[PDB]
Ligand binder design. Sequence first.
Ligand SMILES: *[C@H](O)[C@H](C[C@@H]1CCNC1=O)NC(=O)[C@@H]1[C@@H]2[C@H](CN1C(=O)COc1ccc(OC(F)(F)F)cc1)C2(C)C
Ligand SMILES: *[C@H](O)[C@H](C[C@@H]1CCNC1=O)NC(=O)[C@@H]1[C@@H]2[C@H](CN1C(=O)COc1ccc(OC(F)(F)F)cc1)C2(C)C
Lengths: 306, 306
Amino acid sequence: SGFRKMAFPSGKVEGCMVQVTCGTTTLNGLWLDDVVYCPRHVICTSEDMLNPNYEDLLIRKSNHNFLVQAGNVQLRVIGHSMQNCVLKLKVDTANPKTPKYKFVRIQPGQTFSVLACYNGSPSGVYQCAMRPNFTIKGSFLNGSCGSVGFNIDYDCVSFCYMHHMELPTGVHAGTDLAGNFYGPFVDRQTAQAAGTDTTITVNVLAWLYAAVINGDRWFLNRFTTTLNDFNLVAMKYNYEPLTQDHVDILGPLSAQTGIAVLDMCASLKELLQNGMNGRTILGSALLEDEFTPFDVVRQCSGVTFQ
Amino acid sequence: SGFRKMAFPSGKVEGCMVQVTCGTTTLNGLWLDDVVYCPRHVICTSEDMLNPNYEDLLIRKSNHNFLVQAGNVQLRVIGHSMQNCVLKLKVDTANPKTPKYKFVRIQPGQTFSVLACYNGSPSGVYQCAMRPNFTIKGSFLNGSCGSVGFNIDYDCVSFCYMHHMELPTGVHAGTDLAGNFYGPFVDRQTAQAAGTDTTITVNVLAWLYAAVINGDRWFLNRFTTTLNDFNLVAMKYNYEPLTQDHVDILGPLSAQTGIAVLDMCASLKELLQNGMNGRTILGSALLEDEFTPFDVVRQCSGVTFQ
Ligand SMILES: *[C@H](O)[C@H](C[C@@H]1CCNC1=O)NC(=O)[C@@H]1[C@@H]2[C@H](CN1C(=O)COc1ccc(OC(F)(F)F)cc1)C2(C)C
Ligand SMILES: *[C@H](O)[C@H](C[C@@H]1CCNC1=O)NC(=O)[C@@H]1[C@@H]2[C@H](CN1C(=O)COc1ccc(OC(F)(F)F)cc1)C2(C)C
């Protein structure tokens, strides 16, 4: 027992991080087979960042302008191309540490682990969700661009995020590995802001089940509620609506604990209306929303990866 | 900016986890050079666990009773010995992935990352502190014994914890890598309990500085307090005393923010007496105490590891 915000083991990804320097810009790149992926604003400078026409900026580059430095070994670049907001630098060497991988584009509310990197060297690993407003609340300092987020699923790394920028509110914005941004953000230093966020309802309910599996039973009740009447109370507290697809998803957890999904919604209703009144759930005084139903099952039954 | 409970990258340790089976017991082992370390209660059975005389249990073993299975390769054991509560199995092969490492025994209140493992395969990674009562609040299911906790410091892995047991209250107890338990626990299924815990005062103060670096300034004030008068209020809320050594430690953070340590104590005083009153600090509605002064500086300035 116990319940912790758990990241995936980072080893398979650490073997892919490299440093990419062009001009006066250093950031991280992701080296898979003979290609290095990185944010395209590495070809910028400080006066570029206002309003670049990245196509203009890149027709003006040569291969030798890109220092790709893989620890203590320099990787010769032999070609370059742009896909949306990422660069793909073709190098003369294939990474022998290339794991089995996929590029996936995740839905808001799904979670992933982030390996924060600087100068191609990993700094730490932590778990994040994609917020409903397509930001993530990460931990990123200057030079972290190029760090990726990922999930592992047996032996395969599904890469789902590359870091590009911080917004004025201190949240973070980036792309999938094909360089399409999550949300309406652009890789420009102009006025942008995150949009109103909401709480991820289905995740809260999964986290409440985690709590019950782990022996927190103070917030339960017999009241029940209809899905309709639950969503009327959720919209008042800035929670996303609950769909039957969310309900079905919560089936295995409902079954394991013996608490009907709609009964757990009746619990959440009274927690939103009364607060917690000094109590805590899983060592948290807030309703936690960055655990998926999958995350709970995975952790509460011990799934591993090879 | 941003502030997350960050684990160290797990790669160097993943390359050391192996599976150890003796009799009807499977757990994890740590393979460094030609030695595999694991909890000694692997030589037990179910009726053993009441009150074993592990010396009796081990004089009765042969090398071939220990299946040490390193992924898809079996490691022949060629010798075995017991040091305190861990076994050291000598194997005919040295792990080529052995990182630079040390065994360290940490003080309560220090933090470390835990790579949870099952059947020699890593499941996830997360950050923990050693509580003042020498438990840790981890996430561990049956078969996780042998997972280690560690810190990284440039290129060197300092191993500081190996998992052995869960106590009735759902917290976790284990040893350093030389097999001496943290706290008064023994590797026996008999009546044991954790002892009263306290909150790690110096860590809370570091976490408050993290908050200020990241722009949370609602809990600040001009009141100041003496160290004496602060500790009178701390003891009433079950916090550990603050020492000048704690104060000096908090020097760099005090300097970076411009807030004297004793001023930040005056802040913490009023947060203990008034609560937070709806506000949150770093997305937490509780005072967080598993970030060390070192953890804060590391994260708020981007230190990496090679
Ligand atoms: C790349 O390593 C770096 C990481 C960030 C630095 C600090 N924290 C980070 O996550 N990215 C980076 O610098 C991007 C680059 C330039 C601007 N940028 C930002 O993160 C800041 O962007 C930004 C957005 C909006 C905004 O509002 C203002 F007032 F209108 F202009 C200011 C700045 C790229 C090209 C986006
Ligand atoms: C090893 O993988 C396993 C991990 C734990 C199983 C569930 N969560 C875990 O962390 N360890 C393990 O089973 C140890 C083994 C046997 C007992 N044990 C426990 O974790 C439970 O110990 C325990 C302590 C006190 C207690 O009180 C009671 F009522 F008095 F007896 C009950 C059980 C070793 C040899 C400690």
